[PDB]
Design a protein around this ligand. Sequence first.
Ligand code: ZQ0
Length: 121
Amino acid sequence: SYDIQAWKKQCEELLNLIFQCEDSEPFRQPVDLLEYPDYRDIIDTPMDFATVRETLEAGNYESPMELCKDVRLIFSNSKAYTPSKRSRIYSMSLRLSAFFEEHISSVLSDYKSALRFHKRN
Ligand SMILES: CCCCNC(=O)N1CCN(C(=O)c2ccc(C)o2)CC1
């Protein structure tokens, strides 16, 4: 399965599944600084799933590893901003992270395998 370009549509489909998850609602658009006035005191690099989808559709990811780094930043931002491990929005992030990691692992493996096959000779 050595298609070097296959990751892009695989990531589009996984983003569609994440947008159908009720657990993604807080992560679909940038944090409102009006409602969370201290957000940018703590978070130096905002990230949301609409920004990830737009970056992918612009052709501004070279690899699924770059997309994976931005999605993991959504989750690390939620962990850094939460006042408690028992917060609603943080708990939604942990379930969504487990779902994302379960589905991205084959996308990364197949891409890296395809690149190794491309350089085989
Ligand atoms: C305007 C449409 C939604 C915008 N998102 C949004 O407001 N947030 C999601 C990110 N965030 C957190 O990760 C987080 C962790 C713990 C708590 C209370 O928030 C801050 C809130």
